[PDB]
């Protein structure tokens, strides 16, 4: 008899391409892409997904949270990625921040790109070091804490001293105080005022000059005194004034210099943050979804093959990686 | 060849028409390579290990850019070498096909003794009838060519 | 007799590198390098190099298109790739701008390095926006339009009001106004001029202060009034003036903040900027001239195998990618 | 072997010294083969699909050098995979010429007839005169071992 | 079979016992090759060619941020790339193993002569004593079946 | 006799990943990774490692070396890498420099990133240009060269010319003067004094608006007069005041504007600086060390195989490639 050795033939399902075979007809195969479908924001199975920068504490914004609001101050969960909802946080507790007159909009965005977020006890620069002996932090009055008691941003003294009147202008030096791997965020400004008001409460009635100088470059204002911006994003509901702040980012070894004149608001504490995290914008989280990773493009999405066909975007966990076309791999004998 | 059940597989064409049995120890080799290939495809969407501090957006333009032009350069790299790999395992999966032929094909060269007319295409034609009960004990193993009549291999002892 | 089955021998013309052989002799090969020959700079075959912004508006540079100047508002053609000619754009019509003491100089090979540039209908900021309600955009006298009718910049108003003395300040908020995959493109700035002549025309005599905070960071300037650079890039034989020029980018979403004493000169119209395009630097095209690839060190190149060995630079279209040694691809048997 | 016309071919030599002819049909699937391989080096100057907003130049310098950064990275990482797949494609192309005269080899195993003694390095021996038509009928596939005189496989009935 | 000296040989079992000889030619091939495979696999942590102007530290943060993403970007792809080359060429290297084994069966195919028979696991059968002698003949391909009083191929004259 | 052709056992001793095969037991095997170890820092074996930017100039730092000070201009030899043993250079010659209210902290850290570091002879601006015709350099005082003689920094002049008062200002333009592939770094500034001295000096009791405008960007400062920090980085035991740098950097092809009042200190001289060269963080270099490569994290490490398991960091020579995990490739039979 004739005995044979070899393989089956069937009929042919998929084309497969190769090197140098062409497209090969083959009895089956394995589709290693997939179209992504949209889903909700949620977490990762692996982890927290930060969302808002304190979600136990009610009644806050995240900007409010980042600023140390008297009432604002809660728990920071860790997180494995975070969520990126507000392009422009807004605040709604203390007094009001001109924030689209300088770069500290951003500021509850660069706090959520790291997983520990901690408040660091003690001002960055303490009252006892500045030129004009008796420095105080004055309460606000419109940051009331809890009970109604006047307060201050504990990120922000408003600071006065033993005297009023016109001065050359005075220099500090603040240096990271964090740990090795921690960056140190900062936060100074300076009250603006009708000329009347910043000569009752400061001496003087002209612009004064803030200069600051920090691994990121120079910085300069002089904060015209009267025809304020409409009043918006405080507690306040007659204000006068408005607060014009910086902020400033450290990195271990590093100094920074702040040259400022009167109506200086000075560093009152300052935010630690540990390791990198990944961020995506998108819609704040489902309660109770969960998916494998996160898209910008697509919501909460999973991963049945390595690869997908679909919008190009940013994506945090266990993602599978964009192609350009449909994927197939051989898994059966080449068609006859 | 096969397909009784598996892709690979022996045959015999004679006086009772085509019978068929099927190796199910090489189909199953050739199915653990092809899975084992497809799970080193699947590595290639974890090659993030370093986590650095990330750029946020609403910042300068320029550095918006640099940092929109790095992930996107490495997105297409990334796209185009899952594509060659895929062509070059898609080839490695259909050589492994006659790789396994081979083999079963000298499995049979050594079963069937120094008789057998090897034809080249992996057929050998033995002076016997060969009906199912000989293409089990091909696949398992077991044929020997003096239950049949056939010559065995000389012994090397001399 | 002895019939045997093999492959024939021949003289061996190439040595090809391998993996595990070392230098194998084959009897031919192929050479997937070559050496780039400088041609003239043109089109690249599947569509247009954009090279001068507006190629049928004779008698004006990229600069005054981009100004807006009344007699350079021509038609922009798409393109798929752009020359960069010149590293200082010049302008030659209308009132003299400081183009180096800001970032304006680059205006023209920033709208250059997009798809589709559009002039989009309207002022970035309304006139009627303003806090000096009577608001007019006066005619330069050194900006002619065509019949030697006294006029204005497209993209910049010479905004006067109903007052004149020192003042405050005044706020205006730009937002972005183009559409979602648009990027919008604002000139902005300030008229300095001699004291005298400031007072004449706005009831000051000392320098004013000018700020502006968009997503690029805070921008300050407090123009000299008097001691110009020499007269130059412009229509005008006197200007006793000069014009500070400031460039603002936004994309979707983002805002820009302009704080503004007296003298200022606003928006009076932006560009909108579509899909992206390379850009490399190299002379204005050859009239007639088609090539496969633009090189920056070689001109217009053809591709007559996919690598290239030679200097290194940018390239666009359907470039060979540059290796660093000659590359042979076996053709054939090993030579015996 | 081979060059009549081709690289591939078969020759035989004996009484009437050296005859030689080509297999045009495989010496083709060499080149095709060839070809394709060379096809798929052409695809690594393609792998720019996405386009992002350029970073002009006369900028601050650090984000210059940032860009220029990205571009040689990619430019020395383009190069180096380069001269990689050309090492790797022509060690392939070379085995290649191995594999192809293996299944010459086998070609004549199966068209010589059980009779013709295999010697290892693909020559077969046979007992008759193999002189040009001998060469044209292994070429083309129609060789009949009866029409020399020679012993045909026995057949599969019994 | 082998390692008397060498990772590849010969040996001949039957009354006399089990005798082993070992090809260094064969052997020195195989460590040849695995040297050149680990020779290409040195040159991947040479592909920078290009000098930049390198970014200096103590700046903007995001600028640093950026020139910091890059080199973890080229490293992690590096690291991943070299990993991906150390599996195939041990696939590769374990490969040329059975390749290697091939060719020393067909050398055997050749020196034993028509009547030796080829059991298809690399072993033949002879009728004559293999004593260490013919060991050593078979290594240095020496080898002349007539020696034995075994047939030798049939000439091409007739 | 039976004649195999084959292979031998022998026990295994390894076992090394592979594509299909899983984990393959295996005689032998090459070990392709190593664990670094720690050791000095040194030279590279193909060069030198720059370390101290004039090493052959005893009792300056690299900071008065790159500020030109009259007894700290030696010879600087080329290298192929450098160490960065000083993240703030400090000065230690001549009048005061406030280098945390600048950019010119970083600036020994710019020059040694590249090869060869040349001081270009002639004023950047020459004197003889200057608006206040008879501009000359006058003698610190606090700059003693060699024999106790009053001198100056070699990169910065002191200018003073007839008149004293306020001005309007006066514009100058630097245009790049080092060859096509030579970047060139300028030193200029403000000195800033008590109102007393400043009026003595110049005619002025206010402090003056400096201004630049290079590629970088716009620089503005207006230093405070008096309230100085406390005297340090200095050769002088008594200042009264302090001088304010600002380091600026222009490419071929490439111009920056400085508008500058009174009390303006212009560009004495400047570097020219070819080709860059890698730079690692570190110590300084160990008298007589030689290692194949400088690592980040290990000093000189030698390379015994191609890749290494350990910490990530950049490294400069012949180093090894990190990989993550210990990697073995086959050098021996399958094992039985
Ligand atoms: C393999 O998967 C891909 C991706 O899911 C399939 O391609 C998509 O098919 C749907 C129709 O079901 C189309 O609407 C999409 O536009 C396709 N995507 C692309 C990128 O073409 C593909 O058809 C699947 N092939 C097989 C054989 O299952
Ligand atoms: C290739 O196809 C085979 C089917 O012929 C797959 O094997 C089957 O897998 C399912 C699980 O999804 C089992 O329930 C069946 O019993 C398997 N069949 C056999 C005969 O083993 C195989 O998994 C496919 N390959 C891959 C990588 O998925
Ligand atoms: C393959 O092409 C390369 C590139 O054109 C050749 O190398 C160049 O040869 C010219 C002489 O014709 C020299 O002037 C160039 O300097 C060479 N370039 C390099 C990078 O070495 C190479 O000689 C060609 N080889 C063959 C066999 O055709
Ligand atoms: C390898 O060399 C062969 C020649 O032996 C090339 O084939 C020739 O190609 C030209 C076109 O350039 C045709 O006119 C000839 O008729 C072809 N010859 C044969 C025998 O077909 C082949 O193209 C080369 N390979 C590559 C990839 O270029
Ligand atoms: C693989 O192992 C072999 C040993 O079996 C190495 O060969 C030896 O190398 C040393 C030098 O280190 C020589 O002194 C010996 O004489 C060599 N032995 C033989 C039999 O040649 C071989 O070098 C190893 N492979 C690699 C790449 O190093
Ligand atoms: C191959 O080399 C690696 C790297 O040196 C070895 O892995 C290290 O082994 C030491 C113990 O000698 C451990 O302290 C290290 O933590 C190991 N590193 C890692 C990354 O695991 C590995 O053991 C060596 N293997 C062989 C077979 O020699």
């Known amino acids: ?336 | 060849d096969g397909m009784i059940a598996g892709w690979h597989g022996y045959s015999s064409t004679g006086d009772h028409g085509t019978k068929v049995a099927a190796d199910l120890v090489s189909t199953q080799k050739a199915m653990d390579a092809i899975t084992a290939r497809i799970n080193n495809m699947n590595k290639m969407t974890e090659r993030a290990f370093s986590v650095t501090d990330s750029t946020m957006q609403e910042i300068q333009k320029e550095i918006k850019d640099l940092d929109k032009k790095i992930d996107d350069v490495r997105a297409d790299e990334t796209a185009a070498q899952i594509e060659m790999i895929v062509l070059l395992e898609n080839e490695n999966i259909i050589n492994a096909e006659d790789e396994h032929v081979h083999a079963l094909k000298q499995k049979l060269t050594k079963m069937l003794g120094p008789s057998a007319q090897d034809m080249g295409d992996g057929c050998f034609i033995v002076d016997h009838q060969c009906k199912e009960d000989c293409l089990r004990e091909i696949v398992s193993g077991n044929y020997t060519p003096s239950k049949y009549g056939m010559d065995e291999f000389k012994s090397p002892i001399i």
């Open chain 1, 1 to 336: 008899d004739k005995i044979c050795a070899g393989v089956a033939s069937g009929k042919g399902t998929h084309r497969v391409e190769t090197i140098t075979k062409g497209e090969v007809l083959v009895t089956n195969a394995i589709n290693m892409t997939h179209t992504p479908t949209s889903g909700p924001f949620g977490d990762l199975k692996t982890g927290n997904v930060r969302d808002k920068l304190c979600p136990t504490c009610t009644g806050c914004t995240d900007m409010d949270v980042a600023l140390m609001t008297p009432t604002c101050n809660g728990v920071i969960p860790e997180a494995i990625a975070a969520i990126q909802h507000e392009n422009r946080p807004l605040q709604s507790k203390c007094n009001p921040i001109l924030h689209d007159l300088g770069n500290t909009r951003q500021l509850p965005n660069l706090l959520r790109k790291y997983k520990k977020i901690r408040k660091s006890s003690g001002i960055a620069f303490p009252l006892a070091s500045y030129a004009d002996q008796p420095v105080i932090s004055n309460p606000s009055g419109n940051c009331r804490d809890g009970n109604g008691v006047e307060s201050e941003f504990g990120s922000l003294l408003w600071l006065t001293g033993n005297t009023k009147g016109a001065i050359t202008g005075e220099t500090i030096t603040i240096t990271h105080q964090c740990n090795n791997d921690e960056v140190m965020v900062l936060v100074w400004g300076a009250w603006a005022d009708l000329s009347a008001t910043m000569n009752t409460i400061y001496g003087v009635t002209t612009p004064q000059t803030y200069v600051s100088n920090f691994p990121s470059g120079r910085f300069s204002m002089s904060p015209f005194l009267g025809n304020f911006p409409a009043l918006a994003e405080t507690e306040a509901t007659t204000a006068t004034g408005r607060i014009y702040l910086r902020m400033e980012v450290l990195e271990s070894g590093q100094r920074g210099t702040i040259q400022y004149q009167r109506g200086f608001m000075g560093p009152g504490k300052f935010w630690c943050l540990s390791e990198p995290i990944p961020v995506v914008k998108g819609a704040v989280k489902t309660n109770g979804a969960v998916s494998d990773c996160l898209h910008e493009v697509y919501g909460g999405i999973s991963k049945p093959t390595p690869f997908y066909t679909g919008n190009r975007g940013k994506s945090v966990g266990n993602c599978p990686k964009w192609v350009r076309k449909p994927l197939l791999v051989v898994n059966g004998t080449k068609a006859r």
